[PDB]
Amino acid sequence: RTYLYRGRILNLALEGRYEIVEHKPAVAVIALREGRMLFVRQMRPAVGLAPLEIPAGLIEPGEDPLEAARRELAEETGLSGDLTYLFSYFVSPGFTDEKTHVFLAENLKEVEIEVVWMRPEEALERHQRGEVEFSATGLVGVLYYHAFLR
Amino acid sequence: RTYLYRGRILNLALEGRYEIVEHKPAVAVIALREGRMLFVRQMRPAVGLAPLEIPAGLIEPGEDPLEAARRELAEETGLSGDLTYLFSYFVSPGFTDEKTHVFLAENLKEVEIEVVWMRPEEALERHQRGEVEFSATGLVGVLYYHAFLR
Ligand SMILES: [Zn+2]
Ligand SMILES: [Zn+2]
Structure with a gap:
């Protein structure tokens, strides 16, 4: 377990051959109101576009x-x-x-x-x-809705 | 877009303040037969346990x-x-x-x-x-099944 980088939201380590990115756990919230699901969008530099997500974030200490x-x-x-x-x-x-x-x-x-x-x-x-x-x-929000919220 | 590491399945870069991990795209296969879904498990050093997944992998060149x-x-x-x-x-x-x-x-x-x-x-x-x-x-496999395959 050798570390090559310790950043803000992630660390890059190695376990011999495997490259591992340690990352804080997260949460996501599925919310439905009057048939509409609560989605959120924001610029995501890692992907270069704004995908459809649901309220989410990293768990704080x-x-x-x-x-x-x-x-x-x-x-x-x-x-x-x-x-x-x-x-x-x-x-x-x-x-x-x-x-x-x-x-x-x-x-x-x-x-x-x-x-x-x-x-x-x-x-x-x-x-x-x-x-x-x-x-x-x-996607999880969308599939969850179709499976149990109709 | 400054790179700090170029590995086998991932690269670690920086875009000023954002830490970004470039990773190859992947695929996953949902398969149902006689009411059973085709799950697979394997040791995953990044998490230290074997979660329930479905056939999946990285797309090759x-x-x-x-x-x-x-x-x-x-x-x-x-x-x-x-x-x-x-x-x-x-x-x-x-x-x-x-x-x-x-x-x-x-x-x-x-x-x-x-x-x-x-x-x-x-x-x-x-x-x-x-x-x-x-x-x-x-999880996507499980929710997809409950939503459209019953
Ligand atoms: Zn937030
Ligand atoms: Zn494979």
Whole structure:
């Protein structure tokens, strides 16, 4: 376990042959209101475009997943709600340890980059047409809706 | 765009303030047979455990997504089938450009690490019980099944 770089949101290490990127865990929030899912978009320099995502962010020190979810929902959309843990996933276990905890948000109330309310069916249609790209969180949100929220 | 490392499956660069990990695009294959989904597990040093995933891999030079999907299905499970493109997603746009192309595989036939045939309902139940972890591809497979394959 030799480190080649220790940055702000990630560290680059090596375990003999495997290249490993240590990354802070994250959260994502699925929220549906009047048939529209709460998507967000922001410039993502790593990909050069703004994919359709859902409120999400890194868990801060001292924070647990639930608290981070509450914070990201409020900071990115100015909303609060009743949160329920759904499931988790490793974004790409072949090279990074980033783990994402997904929550469902209900009974949204306004308490205070781009907020994109859109029907999941439309988000899927646009993607299939090549009009918009998805982040893992965005796709998970869309599939979750089609599977359990209709 | 300054590079700090150029490795085998990834490069670590910087765009002023943003730390960016360039990564080859990948593919994942969703396959259902007699109610069981085709999951695979392998030791993942980056996470220290073996999450439930679906056949997947990096696209090789000269290969397009469809061809890579065919290859990974055959190399990891020894199967071939009729493939259909479903959708794509960026695993974690906040720091990497890894894009995953997801395919559906039907009419599987045997042509030649661990193959785990399991009902998606059971995979979800086990995860909720904390018995197994999911990779993004595994979760996408499970949600896709619940949404469109029942
Ligand atoms: Zn944030
Ligand atoms: Zn492979």
